[model samples]
Target: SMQYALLFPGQGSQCIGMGKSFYEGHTLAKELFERASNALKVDMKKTLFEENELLKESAYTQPAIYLVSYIAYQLLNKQANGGLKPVFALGHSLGEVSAVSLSGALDFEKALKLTHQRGKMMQEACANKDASMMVVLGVSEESLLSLCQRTKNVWCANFNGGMQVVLAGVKDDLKALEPTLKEMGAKRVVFLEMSVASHCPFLEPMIFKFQELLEKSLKDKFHFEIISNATNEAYHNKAKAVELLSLQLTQPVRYQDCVKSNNDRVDIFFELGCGSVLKGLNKRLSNKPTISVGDNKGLDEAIEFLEEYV
Candidate 1:
């Protein structure tokens, strides 16, 4: 059997009750949830399980999503008892640190701080630059990049697949292009909820601050393979890890390339986060079955895959 690959998701899919099942039902997961509160200095239980405004803000949203995803990964790992062997681990945007921590390159608590600073800086970056991002379906990244080059503010931010490209730029520029793109045969061009053009030139200035935080939080060594989002290559050492992660702030996410490079390396994927979002992204690039585990019911299904794969 091929060893599994773990894909951790980034922002945009969070909701209340993310880990309510494990928090209310399991002891280990609940302890981690408490740890999350201390890590970010917030009532994670209420922030995640109750209706609130902070959940939408980048400051609270990043930490909240990280906490839930981390807890979900922990519970799934425990169910395997060392039998779960991952060939490689990958993440989408902020979720990259989750992979680094889970693979032992960074401490779990340290990731919270890293993401906290990341969220804060990115928010500030957004405020500094009037920008936004959007998803453009049924258009190749190459064509989008070509068209964006003629514009003053637009650029390709995430090459999700050949046809699914994510564009980022000044808010007005994105709104201006919607009609033209649709006229050019794009199936859909929808603006994202983010105020900042994440993974674009708007975030280039925030890299230095993020690097400082990452340097302070990263571990000395990694425990397993980590497929990098910046390079779509395997992480080899600390210097490279730090360099790539820093660049990831200002660079487009080449997730499509990452998935393509590992097509023959892993049999299945298990996305441990708030939603089955990564599974949907993977299907666009490959056919590997990816199981999602956000609750006990999902955990049960994941355990069966572990039993079969190992």
Candidate 2:
């Protein structure tokens, strides 16, 4: 048996033509996209298939990205036809919602609802605080954490491993560190386009409400294991998934830790959404073999690659 892990991408992965390949190629993908639109009451087909700037907005962006990943997973699953069963799965930030749904813990529509609400809540929080995020590459976590603590209203958001860390905080506080981070020998510091500062204290209000919503929605059923970045562990005996999900809002994401939590080999890592962002990160973090099925070509490659396992 192969121990493949399904790794999903988060916010920064969204783009204009995400699910189009699946929509055009598979009936399951088309149906899933329609289902997402019905659940969200937003015509995602129009928004995503056509050139639209709404996805750039956090409120729209979250669900839009979630929908694409969801559809991508469906297409992959259909092609897989039980040919492969991932040993485990984990997603970065919002991608966890998709992972939870993929694990059969939540239905497609319900999961999108959660993501939609999460987006709205975070967007509202962004209004409450002036915040932004940036990914700093080639810097030690110690140095990044020190700068975050030294700066006012700033926090080390996501420890993405391989000398990569994402920082989020009040705008000016985050901006003030560019020079410092660069001077500290950071190879790169790319500012994120997201308006909301995620995985930080600023999202406290949204986190609290989401905790309440998730408790009611989760039915304590998960078909496979999905690790949490918040705990860098899985909740099998107890359903602490909701609490861990909420906690990540105000806490830094230990994605790097979560990736290695199993302490075993992962045969292949599958990125089930748009963009190669997570793929790039995994290469830097684990040097694991990864497949990115973001389009028809990528999907064909995944299907072909999995044939050996089948």
Candidate 3:
């Protein structure tokens, strides 16, 4: 039997007018955006269509991506008539919140609010610390770790597969390690335009703030298996999910492991967001067929692709 899985993109996937098509075409999509705007107390419409750079900021980017991904899922669900249940759901970084919510593990409002707070806290942390991120390509994990260890304050953040790894830490640490990484056969070394070092110990302080906000919300039951980025493990327990999510802020994303833990049964991996990053990673990590719904055409392709499986 063919098995299906849903993938959500994390931070760095946000783009201007990401879900404009859905918003214009579907009522549910429009409602989702409106609710998100009201809950976050920010005009999401303006944020997404107008201020391009400010929307790129972590605080705005996380929730913005979530809202779009969630609305996209809803649009798909409506078109499919709820016949597209997946065996597993996984998300990268902020996408994890959307995954949990979509899987019935968390309420939409609560998850939206939590994601907003998470982004705010992370942005604040970035401002208070001297940190940044870099993407290194064409290098093995072993060599990447060795380079990170040699450079103080630098650490491996995202193991994005495709012979690519994102490193994060102080700007100086990245600067000191770039030449060595290039010498170690890294094909390309580029700095990410992020303010803070995420998915690393540098974001530890943001955990407390997130935990406090998350605890106030009630934990709900999950309707499907949720694979966490922090541990790359399936979690159904409410308390454990919350705890892991809080700790996830300070942990490196085990995305490769998350893909592997699916028991090699992922016939197709569908990324529901505005980029092909996760789909690209899945291709490099495994031979599984991967697709990303970065726009309306991609979403339609996913629906048609899943029809065979369903």
State TM-scores per candidate.
Answer: 0.96, 0.94, 0.93
* Candidate 2: tens digits of C-alpha lDDT, residues 1-310: 4568888788888887878887998888888888877877888898887788777777677777778777777777877857447878888888887788787777777887888888888888988566789888998999888888877888998998899899998877777787878889989878887668888888987876898889877877776788887888776312577877788788888888888765375777888888888788777667577889789888888887777665
lDDT for every model?
0.82, 0.80, 0.79
Which runs in model 2 stand beyond 4 Å of their true positions?
A: 81-84
Pairs of residues clashing in candidate 1: none
Report the lDDT of model 3 for residue 82: 66
* Better-scoring candidate (TM-score), 1 or 2: 1
Clashes by residue pair, model 2: none
Q: Which ten residues in a row have the lowest lDDT in candidate 3?
A: 75-84
Model 2: how far residue 183 lies from native, Å? 2.6
Worst 10 residues of 1 by lDDT: 78-87
Question: Mind giving the per-residue lDDT tens digits that candidate 1 earns over 97-154?
Answer: 7788787777767888778778888889889567788899997677888898899888
- lDDT of candidate 2 vs native? 0.80
Q: Candidates 1 and 3: which is better by lDDT?
A: 1
Badly placed stretches (over 4 Å) of model 3 are none
Candidate number with greatest lDDT = 1
In angstroms, give how far residue 137 of model 1 lies from its true place: 1.0
